[PDB]
């Protein structure tokens, strides 16, 4: 629903819009809860087999086109601090800038608890930045 509102502002109004989402994981979690009752065999860990496709359709809609631009900031929950989990991992390929937070950093009094060795950015190239 919210993405639809942003799309309208992007296309019809031709404006540069911000889109904040918190939390995108719950979208995956909710579909997994109903997946069992729809007669679908659970996949690994226990998520629905359509985890990758359902998220991809939503994520591809969150993009900047020739008409307008959407700057999207999405918060991803890494269950039990396990970044190998299917949901956090599936979301890494649909992003231009990943900010990975670590509990150990926070416990040391460092805020924001960002682990720079695990973060990445697409525009970290001399051609784009100085």
């Amino acid at each position: 629903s919210a993405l639809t509102m942003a799309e309208y502002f992007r296309d019809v109004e031709g404006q540069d819009v911000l889109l904040f989402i918190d939390n995108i994981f719950r979208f995956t979690q909710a579909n997994s809860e109903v997946s069992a009752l729809l007669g679908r065999i659970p996949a690994a860990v226990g998520y629905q087999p359509t985890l990758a496709e359902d998220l991809g359709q939503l994520q591809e809609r969150i993009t900047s086109t020739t008409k307008g631009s959407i700057t999207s900031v999405q918060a991803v929950y890494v269950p039990a601090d396990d970044i190998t989990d299917p949901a956090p991992a599936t979301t890494f390929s649909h992003l231009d800038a990943t900010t990975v937070l670590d509990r150990a950093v926070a416990e040391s009094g460092i805020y924001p608890a960002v682990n720079p060795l695990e973060c990445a950015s697409r525009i970290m190239d001399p051609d784009v930045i100085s």
Partner: protein
């Protein structure tokens, strides 16, 4: 899975604890062989000290 990687991280630390200790073994096998010269040149200075 985190539980499996917990062991992997634990073994990752152990695997390098060895390297640092192994380098220390090399450090202390140079100084042992450097101070082995005394073995040859001792047991004669203290004669009238006895």
């Amino acid at each position: 899975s985190g539980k499996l990687r917990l062991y992997k991280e634990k073994l990752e630390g152990y695997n390098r604890f060895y390297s640092i200790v192994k380098t220390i073994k090399m450090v202390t096998l140079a100084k042992y062989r450097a101070a082995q010269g005394r073995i040859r040149t001792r047991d004669f200075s203290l004669r009238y000290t006895e």
